[PDB]
Design a protein around this ligand. Structure first.
Ligand SMILES: CCN(CCn1cccn1)Cc1nc(C2(c3ccc(C)cc3)CCCC2)no1
Length: 135
């Protein structure tokens, strides 16, 4: 499965409640949920870069599949997790070990759609991106 490419947000479902489970204050939840970030992904063997781009903040992930790393979520919920992103078939599975239970996410492709399900303490956000070519 190859996530490389540029992706534009199409839907973002239940993001504010996901952020509330992360204890993001209400004012910042509304700022964040107005945003419609793009994703720019380069998959280079097991080395993956996922850039989440917005006018408010760019959040960059840069990691090796299968290897645990210290993920610095400053500027988001201001926590740090020990994170591992691994192949589960044609799905990319992320586990973020930390203060919060059941924190992680799942990423996969359907057609020209990138699907992202983000989870924490049973709360679930679903996002869908379309593959785009204007860069
Ligand atoms: C909440 C975890 N981040 C990373 C998502 N992700 C999943 C796999 C790789 N990254 C999701 C996300 N952050 C964001 C941004 C963001 C920034 C300030 C807050 C309080 C919330 C969200 C705005 C656009 C980029 C930063 N928008 O969505």
């Amino acid at each position: 499965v190859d996530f490389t490419g540029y992706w534009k947000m199409l839907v973002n479902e239940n993001f504010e409640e996901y952020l509330r489970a992360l204890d993001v204050n209400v004012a910042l939840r509304k700022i964040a949920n107005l945003l419609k970030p793009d994703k720019e992904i380069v998959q280079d063997g097991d080395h993956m870069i996922i850039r989440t781009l917005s006018t408010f903040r760019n959040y960059i992930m840069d990691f090796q599949v299968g290897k645990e790393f210290e993920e610095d979520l400053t500027g988001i919920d201001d926590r740090k997790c020990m994170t591992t992103v691994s192949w589960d078939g044609d799905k990319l599975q992320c586990v973020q070990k930390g203060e919060k239970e059941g924190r992680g996410w799942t990423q996969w492709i359907e057609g020209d759609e990138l699907h992202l399900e983000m989870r924490v303490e049973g709360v679930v956000c679903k996002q869908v991106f379309k593959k785009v070519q204007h860069h």
